[PDB]
């Protein structure tokens, strides 16, 4: 039944085309085994062709189908790439139509949720220059979707992270840390976290951008979600070299981190113990700063926590500090 609908995507009859497009959209939402059935029927070249359609209703429907196919596995994301979707999607980034724009962002973000080769394919198609421009957008809906795709791109390897840095995304992300909008702030924190998860040169770029003063201030936040992301970013920066570990101490992170060791929130606690454990694995100067903050007695006490994850993280942190 499925290869008839694929042939019907190029059929001159308007009712035939739209009904096939609607049925195929419904199948593309029914799990990876159903997504594969659509791909094996050869719908992908026809759906990509419809992204050039002068009919906004059809364009939106084909774009929605592709976005749901891109939510599948890496083999299904690659099938979307091999069908030439990326050049069409990068063009839809210059669209004055906010509905098509948000849908193109959602599809690109889902493609950037695949492997390193999938993320590199998004980069090679020149998606990053348009995304950095969308970071200055007054449209809160478009800004979040652009921040979401940027974050999924920065979730790849070191070269994929460096591509985000070289595009000039870091100054905007840092300015977005001062945002009163909790959703935009969370997304700007999530991207920075993925950038700091790479190597030492990527971690340094984050420090050079001036992310640490805002990151340290966000530790005094009553928002557990903002708190977890600010902590995860500071922890990833602290997983770098001693000079990078020193930049964390210089900003005044330690008194806030030590205060967070009092938390009954096992999620905040595990991340606070991990961040200090990374700072503790540095040189003598950094170890002395941790001891000076009063972490030693806290780390030693948290070794008696009932939860094995907290117990192990406290043990690892205290070990790295005293060695």
């Amino acid at each position: 039944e499925l290869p008839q609908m694929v042939q019907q995507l190029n059929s001159p009859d308007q009712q035939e085309l739209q009904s096939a497009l609607r049925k195929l959209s419904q199948i593309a939402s029914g799990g990876n085994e159903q997504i594969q059935a659509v791909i094996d029927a050869g719908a992908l070249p026809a759906l990509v062709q419809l992204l050039s359609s002068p009919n906004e209703q059809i364009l939106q429907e084909a774009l929605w189908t592709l976005g749901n196919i891109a939510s599948g596995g890496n083999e299904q994301i690659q099938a979307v790439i091999d069908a030439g979707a990326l050049p069409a999607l990068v063009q839809l980034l210059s669209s004055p139509n906010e509905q098509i724009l948000q849908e193109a962002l959602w599809t690109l973000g889902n493609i950037a949720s695949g492997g390193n080769e999938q993320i590199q394919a998004v980069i090679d198609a020149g998606a990053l220059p348009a995304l950095v421009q969308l970071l200055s957008s007054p449209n809160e809906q478009i800004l979040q979707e652009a921040l979401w795709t940027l974050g999924n791109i920065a979730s790849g390897g070191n070269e994929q992270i460096q591509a985000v840095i070289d595009a000039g995304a870091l100054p905007a992300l840092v300015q977005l840390l001062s945002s009163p909008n909790e959703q935009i702030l969370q997304e700007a924190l999530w991207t920075l976290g993925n950038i700091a998860s790479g190597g030492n040169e990527q971690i340094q770029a984050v420090i050079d951008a001036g992310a640490l003063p805002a990151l340290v201030q966000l530790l005094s936040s009553p928002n557990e979600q903002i708190l977890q992301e600010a902590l995860w970013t500071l922890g990833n920066i602290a997983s770098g070299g001693n000079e990078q570990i020193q930049a964390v101490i210089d900003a005044g992170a330690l008194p806030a981190l030590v205060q967070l060791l009092s938390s009954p929130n096992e999620q905040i606690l595990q991340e606070a113990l991990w961040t200090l454990g990374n700072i503790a694995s540095g040189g003598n100067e950094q170890k002395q700063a941790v001891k000076e903050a009063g972490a030693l007695e806290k780390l030693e006490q948290l070794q008696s926590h009932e939860n094995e994850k907290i117990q192990k993280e406290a043990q690892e942190a205290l070990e790295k500090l005293q060695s």
């Binding site: 419904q26 939510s71 999530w190 991990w274 690892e316």
Partner: protein
């Protein structure tokens, strides 16, 4: 310091892949993650099924994060104790995952 040995890989293996000995071919293959204490080294240069010679580390201190552990290896302590009887040394692990997918309709 890096050692060399004949390679008997069945698929692509990047740098930091743990290696074990294949008793049949007498060549080095990727460590299964099921045979306890069978890991002999860590791949230094990315290789595959066509590669004749593997360049690997037979000694050194490596972080747990840096090593590309196989899917079959589930136990954290069994991974740490995989290089038992060798000059290799392991450290500690992280916490979550970060690849976001959004399915609608």
């Amino acid at each position: 310091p890096t050692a060399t040995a004949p390679g008997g890989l069945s698929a692509k293996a990047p740098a930091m892949t743990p290696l074990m000995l294949d008793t049949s071919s007498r060549k080095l293959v990727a460590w299964d993650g099921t045979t306890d204490g069978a890991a002999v080294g860590i791949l230094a240069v990315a290789a595959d099924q066509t590669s004749t010679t593997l360049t690997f580390y037979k000694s050194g201190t490596f972080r747990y994060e840096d090593v590309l552990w196989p899917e079959a290896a589930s136990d954290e302590t069994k991974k740490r104790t995989a290089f038992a009887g060798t000059a290799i040394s392991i450290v500690g692990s992280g916490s979550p995952k970060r690849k976001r997918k959004r399915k609608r309709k």
